[PDB]
Homo-oligomer: A and B are copies of this chain.
């Protein structure tokens, strides 16, 4: 028989083979052994079940593994295979309408998407917190932070300059293809998911928002837009291509899971915001601006980022991006 589930397995394969992500959760859960032992847990978006099994292994008395997509069936098999069917219960469907037999002492969730909020799953976690978490209960991870940095993307620089290198390799001048390539690769309003490294970072990364996930008002902050202003000074001479956005989350003890290009790579990579064309900058060129993360009005699952930026003495500009 033929099945149409390639993407289902591949997304969960990518997450579990992400050792930074999976080991950070494993250890962040283990570090909360004191708060979980003999207690009850809700795993929001349990996927293949691995975080719910981690919670049971951390001492949890009972875990409700709630999963809306078709992969829930695999999670129930994984639970049984690990001998945990008496303590980890896999519940299909959205956490917003699942029926648990009790409120829970803790919620664990791997809810983050590209640019932190793509897929807009955080609202489901907060809904579950309001509906099912006991007063003073535990949320894992407990907080998120958002970061921005100006970038000179080395790979993009090579792709753009490639056309002027053709003469050196084939004896045909194609340097007029550079304006065309720049229009096509940068003159669009899509957020580009790409992994960078420290070689690409043009100034000290700036924290522009800090989200305490249990805080009053956050569900409404998410609808109005999460973000803030930033300011930085360029390290050296380079073409500025735009900005990279990334995040970390923290497990209280604390253990930090980072998606920074200065840190080990993860499947989240970074969310890149390209200007329409490169801007030359030098050492100590001042850059300031504002970043807002928003749901897109067409598809609230889809991340929108509104960028305001000012490079040196240029006028401030605005560019409105939506997830690729």
Contact = CB atoms under 8 A, between A and B. Distances in A.
B172 A9 contact: no
A241 to B, nearest CB: 15
Contact of A180 (B17, B74, B81): B74
Given A13-B162, A189-B2, A53 B184 contact: no
Chain A contact residues: helix, strand, loop or mixed: helix
B81 A176 contact: yes
B159 A13 contact: yes
18 contacts: A1-B276, A2-B187, A3-B188, A5-B180, A5-B183, A9-B181, A9-B185, A16-B162, A16-B174, A22-B170, A26-B170, A50-B174, A74-B176, A74-B177, A74-B180, A77-B176, A78-B176, A81-B176
Nearest to A172: B53
A85 interface: no
A135 interface: no
Top 4 closest pairs, chain A to chain B, by CB: A5-B184, A9-B184, A77-B176, A3-B183
Contacts of A17: 162
A8 interface: yes
Interface string A107-148: 000000000000000000000000000000000000000000
A248 interface: no
Contact of A187 (B3, B23, B173, B187): B3
